[PDB]
C-alpha cells in the first residue's frame, strides 16, 4: 500500500509521433484506472536532453491525468536511456521531489531498445538500480522485437525475471500484471 512508480519514456527521433501519441494514451490509461493505495507517479521524458514533466509533488497536487498528459510533446533527439536511468533514481526517486519513505519503487521504461549517443553505458546504471531497489519494467515499442540487439538491450534494462518485467507496448496487460503483482503485495 506504499508505492512509487516512475516513467522513463524514450522521446528520441526513432520514436515516430504515433508511438508518441500511443505512449501518451497508454501512460494515461494506467493512471485513470489505478488510483489505488495512494499510488504515486512521476515521469521524465528522455532523449539527447531530458524533461521532468512532473515530480511526485507536482503530481500530488494535480491528480487529473488527461489534463496532465495531452500537452506533453516530443524532443526528437537521440537515445540516452542509461543516463536517464540514474537521473530518475537520483532526482525523481529523491525524497526532495516527493518520494515517500518506505514506498515501493517501480520504473516503467518506454523505449524502442536502441541506446544511442549516451555517454553513459548500461553497465553503470543497472547494478545501482539493483543496489537501490527499483523494480524495472520495460515497455518496448515499434520494431523493438524484430531485430536482435533491440530486444536484448530491453532485457538488459528490465530486472529479472523478464517474464514479469519485460512487456510489449500494445498489450494492455502489463498494468493488470503490476496490478496483481501489487495486489498480492
Partner 1 sequence: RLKHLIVTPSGCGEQNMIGMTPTVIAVHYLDETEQWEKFGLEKRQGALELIKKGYTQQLAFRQPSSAFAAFVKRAPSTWLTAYVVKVFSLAVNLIAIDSQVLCGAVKWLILEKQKPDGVFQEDAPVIHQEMIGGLRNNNEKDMALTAFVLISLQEAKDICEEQVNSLPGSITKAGDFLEANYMNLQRSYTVAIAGYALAQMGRLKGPLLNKFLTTAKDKNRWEDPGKQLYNVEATSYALLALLQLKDFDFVPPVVRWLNEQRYYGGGYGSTQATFMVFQALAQYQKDAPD
Residues lying near partner 1 in the complex (CB under 8 A)? 12-14, 16, 76-79, 114, 116-117, 146-147
Q: Which residue has the cell 519485460?
A: 166
Choose the contact partner of 76 out of partner 1, Mg ion, none; CB within 5 to 8 A by kind. Answer: partner 1
Nearer to partner 1, 16 or 95 (CB): 16
Choose the contact partner of 77 out of Mg ion, partner 1, none; CB within 5 to 8 A by kind. Answer: partner 1
Using rule CB under 5 A, residue 47 touches Mg ion: no
Long-range contacts, stretch 18-22, CB < 8 angstroms, 24+ apart: 19/112, 19/141, 19/142, 19/169, 20/74, 22/141, 22/169
Smallest CA-to-CA distance from 137 within 87, 85, 66 is with: 85
Q: Write the binding mask 76 to 95 for Mg ion: x where contact by CB under 5 A, - elsewhere.
A: ---x----------------
As measured in angstroms, the least distance from the Cβ of 15 to Mg ion is 7
Choose the contact partner of 136 out of partner 1, Mg ion, none; CB within 5 to 8 A by kind. Answer: none
What is the DSSP annotation of 113-139? S--BS-SS-GGGTSHHHHHTTEEEEEE
Choose the contact partner of 95 out of partner 1, Mg ion, none; CB within 5 to 8 A by kind. Answer: none
Number of CB atoms found within 10 A of residue 136's CB: 22
Alpha carbons 16 and 172: distance in angstroms, whole number: 20
Which of 3, 14, 83, 150 is close enough to bind Mg ion by CB under 5 A?
Answer: 14
Per CB under 5 A, residues contacting Mg ion are 12, 14, 79, 114
Amino acid at each position: 500500500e506504499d508505492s512509487d512508480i516512475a516513467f522513463l519514456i524514450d522521446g528520441s527521433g526513432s520514436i515516430i509521433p504515433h508511438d508518441f501519441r500511443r505512449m501518451k494514451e497508454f501512460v494515461s490509461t494506467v493512471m485513470e484506472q489505478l488510483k489505488k493505495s495512494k499510488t504515486l507517479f512521476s515521469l521524465m521524458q528522455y532523449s539527447e536532453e531530458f524533461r521532468i514533466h512532473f515530480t511526485f509533488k507536482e503530481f500530488q497536487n494535480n491528480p487529473n491525468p488527461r489534463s496532465l498528459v495531452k500537452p506533453i510533446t516530443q524532443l526528437l533527439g537521440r537515445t540516452h536511456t542509461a543516463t536517464g536511468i540514474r537521473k530518475v533514481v537520483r532526482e525523481l526517486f529523491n525524497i526532495t521531489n516527493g518520494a515517500r519513505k518506505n514506498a515501493f519503487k517501480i520504473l516503467v521504461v518506454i523505449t524502442d531498445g536502441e541506446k544511442f549517443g549516451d555517454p553513459l553505458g548500461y553497465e553503470d546504471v543497472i547494478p545501482e538500480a539493483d543496489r537501490e531497489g527499483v523494480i524495472r519494467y520495460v515497455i518496448g515499442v515499434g520494431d523493438a522485437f524484430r531485430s536482435e540487439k533491440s530486444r536484448q538491450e530491453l532485457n538488459t534494462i528490465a530486472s529479472k525475471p523478464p517474464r514479469d518485467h519485460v512487456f510489449q507496448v500494445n498489450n494492455f496487460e502489463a498494468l493488470k500484471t503490476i496490478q496483481n503483482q501489487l495486489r498480492e503485495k
